[PDB]
Amino acid sequence: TRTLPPGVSDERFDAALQRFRDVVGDKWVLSTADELEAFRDPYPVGAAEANLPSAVVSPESTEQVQDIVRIANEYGIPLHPVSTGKNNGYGGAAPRLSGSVIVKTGERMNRILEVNEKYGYALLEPGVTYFDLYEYLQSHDSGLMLDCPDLGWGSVVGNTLDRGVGYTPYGDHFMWQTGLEVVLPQGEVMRTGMGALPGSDAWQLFPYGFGPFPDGMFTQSNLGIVTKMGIALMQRPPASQSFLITFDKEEDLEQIVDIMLPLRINMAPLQNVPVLQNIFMHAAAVSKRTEWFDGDGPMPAEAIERMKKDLDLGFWNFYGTLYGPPPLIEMYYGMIKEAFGKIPGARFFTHEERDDRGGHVLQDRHKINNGIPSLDDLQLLDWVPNGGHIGFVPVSAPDGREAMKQFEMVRNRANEYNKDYMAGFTIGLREMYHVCLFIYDTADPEAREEILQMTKVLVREAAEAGYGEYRTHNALMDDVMATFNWGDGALLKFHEKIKDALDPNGIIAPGKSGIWPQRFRGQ
Amino acid sequence: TRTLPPGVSDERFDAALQRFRDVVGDKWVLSTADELEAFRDPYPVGAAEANLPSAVVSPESTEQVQDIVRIANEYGIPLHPVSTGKNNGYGGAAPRLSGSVIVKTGERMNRILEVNEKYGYALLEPGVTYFDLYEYLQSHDSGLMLDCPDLGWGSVVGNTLDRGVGYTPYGDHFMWQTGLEVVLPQGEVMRTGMGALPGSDAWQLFPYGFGPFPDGMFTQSNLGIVTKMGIALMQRPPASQSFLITFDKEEDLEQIVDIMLPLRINMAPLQNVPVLQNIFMHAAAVSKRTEWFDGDGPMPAEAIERMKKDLDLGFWNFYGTLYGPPPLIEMYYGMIKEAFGKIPGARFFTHEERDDRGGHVLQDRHKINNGIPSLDDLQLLDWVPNGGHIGFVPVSAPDGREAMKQFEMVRNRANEYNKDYMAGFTIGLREMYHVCLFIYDTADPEAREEILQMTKVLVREAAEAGYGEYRTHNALMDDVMATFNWGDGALLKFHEKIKDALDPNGIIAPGKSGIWPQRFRGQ
Numbered sequence A, B: 001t002r003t004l005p006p007g008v009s010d011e012r013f014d015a016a017l018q019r020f021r022d023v024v025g026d027k028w029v030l031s032t033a034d035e036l037e038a039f040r041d042p043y044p045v046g047a048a049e050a051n052l053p054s055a056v057v058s059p060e061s062t063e064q065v066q067d068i069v070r071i072a073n074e075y076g077i078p079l080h081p082v083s084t085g086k087n088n089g090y091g092g093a094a095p096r097l098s099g100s101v102i103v104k105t106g107e108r109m110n111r112i113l114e115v116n117e118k119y120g121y122a123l124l125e126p127g128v129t130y131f132d133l134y135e136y137l138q139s140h141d142s143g144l145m146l147d148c149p150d151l152g153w154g155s156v157v158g159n160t161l162d163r164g165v166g167y168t169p170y171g172d173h174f175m176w177q178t179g180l181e182v183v184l185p186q187g188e189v190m191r192t193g194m195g196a197l198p199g200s201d202a203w204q205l206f207p208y209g210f211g212p213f214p215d216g217m218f219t220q221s222n223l224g225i226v227t228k229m230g231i232a233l234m235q236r237p238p239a240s241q242s243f244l245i246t247f248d249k250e251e252d253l254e255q256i257v258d259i260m261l262p263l264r265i266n267m268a269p270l271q272n273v274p275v276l277q278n279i280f281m282h283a284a285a286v287s288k289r290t291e292w293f294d295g296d297g298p299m300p301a302e303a304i305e306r307m308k309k310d311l312d313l314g315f316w317n318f319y320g321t322l323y324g325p326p327p328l329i330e331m332y333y334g335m336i337k338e339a340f341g342k343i344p345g346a347r348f349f350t351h352e353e354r355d356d357r358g359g360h361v362l363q364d365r366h367k368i369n370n371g372i373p374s375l376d377d378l379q380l381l382d383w384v385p386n387g388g389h390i391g392f393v394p395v396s397a398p399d400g401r402e403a404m405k406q407f408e409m410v411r412n413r414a415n416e417y418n419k420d421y422m423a424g425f426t427i428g429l430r431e432m433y434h435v436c437l438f439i440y441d442t443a444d445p446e447a448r449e450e451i452l453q454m455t456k457v458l459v460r461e462a463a464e465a466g467y468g469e470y471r472t473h474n475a476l477m478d479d480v481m482a483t484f485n486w487g488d489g490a491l492l493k494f495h496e497k498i499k500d501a502l503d504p505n506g507i508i509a510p511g512k513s514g515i516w517p518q519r520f521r522g523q
């Protein structure tokens, strides 16, 4: 069943493969069943085998990436660029279009090119993971801290370019991205910002450069392959304090949101990203599902109460962190206690005060909120056997009623599909995320098809209520982009015009974010 | 000499004009010499008549803007979109390409569509000036403050889309821009971000939306005409304190910069944009040049000393502002005094302590740094008769030696052209601006040609030392874009591919930021 790129003969592909090996070296071009097994989406969705790579090519230099791209152009081979290819929750390393060659840039392009203590930035290659970088910072006893997502094994660049987020004050990764080098779809190479001016020291100091500001167009994008990217790094504060706030009632959501907003909007006293997660989220962190209920299908209210009482946690649980000199920390912690204190049954705990099994999450958020990469959230996959996950994160105004409506909306449709409402609400500055995680048996084809359908429904429903996803799984890219159809799909038509201008042979990551080049449209 | 669009007959233009009048109304289409005089660059540069509009069209609705664009497409008429057309220092309202129709969106599209106290944003049309908006905020007794540039008569949208800056903590305008509506070059209309999702309340709450993030591409851009744009508005703090720091020695620059940086980089204790301006800048604010020296050509050192002694000001003068509860203000003001205090001859003054004639600037920066639009900087045009100005602002790393090198570099070449070094250094977060303003006789054709040459030289020289401009005058767009030529002009080739994809008839603002569509290239 040898996987072949669309409309490419066995012969031409053998030639191309040869030319690829000529570029990177025989060792670093894979093209057999056994070898290609490793790059399967590790959390598959759907019953069906979807996404299947024709080869993997691991280049070591920008110049190689250029050569590959030129070759792919000649032969009309689709390319799927990845950094680490651990985009887990959103489709791992599997290409939207079958028969694509995966370009694994991060396998060999994994250098920390520069870290600068004075101006507080780093310039990185795609292969640099959050662990790799944190190690460097500890090794060299830096005064800087990174900002990490939940799972630290991923690329810093990869994450940034999916507009991923973290929970320190530098939590909007794209905001702090400064400068990148990218290979455009026909093999040209380009630098943005002050990188475009030979000799400039400001590549990682000033993002915008001169003329139209393009970096954004390389996020959630198929307009190139990024080979280098800068990111600002905040200075480690003198001290920090994490804390939990347990709220008993499921109805506390309304007043929690409406109180969070005015504490966050001026980046004080809530200086990190406020995150509020439900009880099911805390159970999965520590226990298996069978511990609380052994029926297939939804949990009864008695289970929920047992989970609350045993772990000693509210239905909603809020986690914040404060940074600065201890006066300021105390001053702010007080303001926060006075603020949320006005909700019946609101208990408060610092990262000192809880070493019990319910305070596991608090210990974990203390690490994350301080730029310490973990893999703690993989423990949430032991909730059920063969556990995997899919992410769904609609965006809305930070209003209690609106939050309550989302809670009802999702949990409802979730129970219809016999799945647990593992959800949270977080707030950026003026915006609300409904961070839903759904855990499922990855070895059961039914379960996979069910999850796919469920999210597709959640997406359709959310969009009908005015809620769009900020990011989605490989499997729902087409669906999600269809929700952003104002002006009769004006946005996507724009994306398409640009896609076709930079990528006339339709080479790069066809379908990414729902954007297909001309030769794939009509399908 | 009736001005005509490139390659359009008197007849076709008369038809088009008719079709334009059909769209907007006879009153709002201008096309005679007397009428068109008003839209001349009010601060001309060069001896020669450059830039000359064939008509002005003032639409009232997005839908009209669409109709105009469709008409312009048919006839191949170039369009020059403006909001207010007070881009003074950078070419006013005059089109890069002669025979262009100016679209004055801000004449009639000047509504404040929404201001939202809870979430802290506004949604604006192009015609809303900083005065218009500030009035609204005072009228409605808002808890919000705007962030204004030096000259308040300009558009909020216009400014934002040139990546203009201000001096409050919300001083990076583009950063706070959230959502826009734009008419693309073939007349299509589009919304970015959560605006693209029908029903979403998050258009001004979350900038990025889904898929590639395009807003940046409409800054310093000729890729459309913006009809609506959102901007976040910071909450007015409880209280504020502005302050001056006079430094005697011209050599104090080195240590001033190296001390400013670490006070700014964590947005505290320097919470506004630190701005340091030289003595000549303060003289022009209050006096005429003849007052200090009556020779044509550079000022002698005795004059400079007289200016210092009379106004009671250093060669460099630093202006900051602090925001918050009075404890925090005092705590930060102290840290700042201790910090800069380590420089011989450094005196400190609050906005209370100086009502003399040297403290005029301090009074003005207190207004600006607090979101109070002025036109105070027009007083700098009385330095010489028929005064006008051109801006030149290179970007560099915030390093003392680097600053000192820029100071020497510019002042040197400035004196060769018999012009005064009206300059400042400011710092964003991790970046340095060399804010040079050059004032000149606008009624003297020699003076105009001299200024043009001078800046072109300053630009060439700066670029050779690794310094690019963040923004430039109409007259040097081609020159500046030529400095960003890494990878053999990779950046501009990219811009061109996109320009040609969205604008196949080459309609919108040909030449803006050096970006010409196919039909104008080879010239």
Ligand SMILES: *Cc1cc2c(cc1C)nc1c(=O)[nH]c(=O)nc-1n2C[C@H](O)[C@H](O)[C@H](O)COP(=O)(O)OP(=O)(O)OC[C@H]1O[C@@H](n2cnc3c(N)ncnc32)[C@H](O)[C@@H]1O
Pocket (backbone or CB within 6 Å): A081, A082, A083, A084, A085, A086, A087, A088, A089, A092, A093, A105, A126, A149, A150, A151, A153, A154, A155, A156, A157, A158, A159, A161, A162, A163, A164, A165, A166, A220, A221, A224, A225, A226, A227, A377, A378, A380, A389, A509, A512
């Ligand atoms: C399973 C899971 C995942 C997860 C999470 C919690 C769980 C239980 N929590 C997250 C969180 O709090 N925040 C967040 O941002 N992500 C979170 N995730 C997801 C995931 O593990 C992380 O996002 C991770 O940082 C992303 O993985 P990685 O960094 O390995 O990404 P990639 O495959 O290389 O890149 C993803 C996409 O980006 C584009 N891309 C990547 N590299 C390039 C280059 N060089 N050029 C162009 N485009 C590039 C591609 O479209 C690629 O598919």
Ligand SMILES: *Cc1cc2c(cc1C)nc1c(=O)[nH]c(=O)nc-1n2C[C@H](O)[C@H](O)[C@H](O)COP(=O)(O)OP(=O)(O)OC[C@H]1O[C@@H](n2cnc3c(N)ncnc32)[C@H](O)[C@@H]1O
Pocket (backbone or CB within 6 Å): B081, B082, B083, B084, B085, B086, B087, B088, B089, B092, B093, B105, B126, B149, B150, B151, B153, B154, B155, B156, B157, B158, B159, B161, B162, B163, B164, B165, B166, B220, B221, B224, B225, B226, B227, B377, B378, B380, B389, B509, B512
């Ligand atoms: C003379 C002067 C100018 C000045 C200044 C001090 C002096 C003495 N100080 C400034 C400062 O501190 N900060 C700053 O950002 N600007 C400063 N200036 C310059 C100027 O007065 C201001 O920048 C002003 O805000 C800009 O003028 P305006 O707001 O009137 O701009 P415009 O002509 O309408 O727009 C300029 C360009 O933007 C693009 N544009 C504008 N509208 C649109 C629409 N609707 N669609 C697409 N593009 C648009 C055009 O390219 C236009 O030429």
